[PDB]
Structures are given as structure tokens and as C-alpha cells.
């Protein structure tokens, strides 16, 4: 119901990165039918950090269970899980699906990993806290990565968001991230001076 909604948006985005543990979890679950929902959820968290991926596997498990009704129920839990994720995590899930193709490409070069890329986009859209916060998160996430290239990645992604957005506050808030990222780029230009100062006085 709200699950169909989120699932619809996820596959629209996530067909572009065709990347089936669904079997492996069937048999692991078929063995030991005595599971809690919180165990299932933790298991999936262990399999992937990314909510859209956990969501995805659950849709895969709900399905592979279409042919395996062998009182193989606690497939009831799978739908309980799906509803928890749709109600509690719908936006996170959708944002993670939306950014996956771009993040995958950028991650390719070895130097900027996929999950901090995803997370960074998501936090910029869902709980932005200002330019100091985003800078600090860039540094924490990409301490041996190419932060300039991350900023670019984000600018491209947010600008596309802005094309389809146009209402009001979402639109304003996207603009503010974008301007803040433009400013971080301006500041790069002064990074050697700041280092010179820092080195003298530290």
C-alpha cells in the first residue's frame, strides 16, 4: 500500500545498476523458522548498510516466497518489515535508490566509496545543517578520498533534483545546499594560504 509506492520509485532508479543473495537467505531462513522481526532486520543491516538495498531484498524475499508457501510463514514478518521500512524509512529509501547509479559511477575510481557518497547526498537533502556541518561530514567520510570530486558529484545531483522539484521550501533548501557547495569550492582556492598559516602557528 505505502510499500507499493516506495517499491515503485526504488525499481525505477535501481534497474540501471543490475547488481541475488535472495536464494542464499531463503535457505538460511528456511533453516531455523524461529526468528524475530528484529533478528531479520538486523540480519539485513549486516548484509547491507543501505536502506534501499535492505528494502529491495525484502521485496525479493516476499516474492521468492510466492512459490514456497510451505507454511513458510513468518513471511508475515517480511511484510511487517516492509511496512516498518515504508512508514519509517520511505524517504531514506527513495533517496538512496535515486542516487545509487551516480554514486556507483563515482565510486568506480577506487578513491570515493559508494556508501559515504550515498549517505552524503541523503543527509544534504534530509537533514542539512549548514556549510560547517557538511564540510565536517565530507572530511569524516572521505579522509583519503577526493573531496573536490565529491562536491561536484553533489552539485550535479542536487541540480538535477532542482529541475523536477519546483514548489517552494524544498526548492529553497536545495538552492541553499548548492550555494554552500559553490562556497566550499571558492574556499579551495585559499587552501594553501590557510595551510601556511596553520603550519606556522601549530
Amino acid at each position: 500500500a505505502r510499500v507499493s509506492d516506495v517499491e515503485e520509485q526504488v525499481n525505477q532508479y535501481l534497474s540501471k545498476v543490475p547488481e541475488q543473495n535472495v536464494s542464499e537467505l531463503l535457505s538460511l531462513l528456511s533453516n531455523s523458522p524461529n526468528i524475530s522481526l528484529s533478528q531479520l532486520k538486523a540480519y539485513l543491516e549486516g548484509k547491507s548498510e543501505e536502506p534501499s538495498e535492505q528494502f529491495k531484498m525484502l521485496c525479493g524475499l516476499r516474492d521468492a516466497l510466492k512459490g514456497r508457501p510451505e507454511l513458510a510463514h513468518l513471511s508475515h514478518l517480511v511484510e511487517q518489515a516492509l511496512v516498518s521500512m515504508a512508514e519509517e524509512q520511505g524517504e531514506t529509501i527513495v533517496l538512496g535508490a535515486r542516487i545509487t547509479p551516480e554514486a556507483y559511477r563515482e565510486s568506480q575510481s577506487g578513491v570515493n566509496p559508494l556508501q559515504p557518497l550515498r549517505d552524503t547526498y541523503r543527509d544534504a537533502v534530509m537533514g542539512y545543517q549548514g556549510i560547517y556541518a557538511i564540510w565536517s561530514d565530507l572530511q569524516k567520510r572521505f579522509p583519503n578520498g577526493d573531496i573536490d570530486s565529491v562536491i561536484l558529484f553533489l552539485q550535479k545531483a542536487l541540480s538535477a533534483d532542482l529541475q523536477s522539484q519546483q514548489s517552494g521550501s524544498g526548492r529553497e533548501k536545495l538552492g541553499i545546499v548548492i550555494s554552500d557547495l559553490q562556497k566550499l569550492k571558492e574556499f579551495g582556492s585559499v587552501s594553501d594560504q590557510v595551510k601556511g598559516f596553520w603550519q606556522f602557528f601549530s
Binding site: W135, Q139, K183, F187, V190, Q193, F201
Partner: protein, 91 residues
């Protein structure tokens, strides 16, 4: 441990502040834990000089740029006075 990316982050936040004030500048100095009043005076002189050579692009407004450079100047003046106060008594 005051990392370079931390100090750059403090500068970003300072330049992002509307109507910064004198304590926002002293905050930067304290992060370095400068061991002497004359080294602190130097710090603020070299800071103002640094900010004054920053391109106009990194600031919000020419008004906020001037404000920020005036607060640096007040900080240097504060640091000088404080240097004098420490030398004003024999004890």
C-alpha cells in the same frame, strides 16, 4: 589535536557568520593554544592579513568582509592591550 581540516572548517564557519564579532575571532586563536601574549598578537595580525588577501568570492558581502576585517583589527587591539596589562605590574 587541531587538524588542518578542522581549522579550515572554523574559517568556513567564521566567514559564514552574519555579523561576526570579536569573540568569534578569539575562538580561532584558542584552538591553537598559543603559549604567550606576543605570539597571540602576531596571530591576529597575520590572521587579518590572511583574510584581507582572500578573494572577494569567499565572503557573503563586501559589508560582511569589512565587518570581519574590523573584528580582526579589534582582536589585534585587544591582544596588544592584554600584552600591556601583563607587563603593567611588577608583582
Amino acid at each position: 589535536a587541531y587538524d588542518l581540516s578542522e581549522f579550515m572548517g572554523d574559517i568556513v564557519a567564521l566567514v559564514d557568520k552574519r555579523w561576526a564579532g570579536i569573540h568569534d575571532i578569539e575562538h580561532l586563536a584558542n584552538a591553537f593554544s598559543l603559549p604567550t601574549p606576543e605570539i597571540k598578537v602576531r596571530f591576529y595580525q597575520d590572521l587579518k592579513r590572511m583574510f584581507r588577501l582572500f578573494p572577494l568570492g569567499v565572503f557573503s558581502d563586501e559589508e560582511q568582509r569589512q565587518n570581519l576585517l574590523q573584528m580582526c583589527q579589534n582582536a589585534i587591539d585587544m591582544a596588544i592591550e592584554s600584552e600591556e596589562e601583563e607587563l603593567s605590574e611588577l608583582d
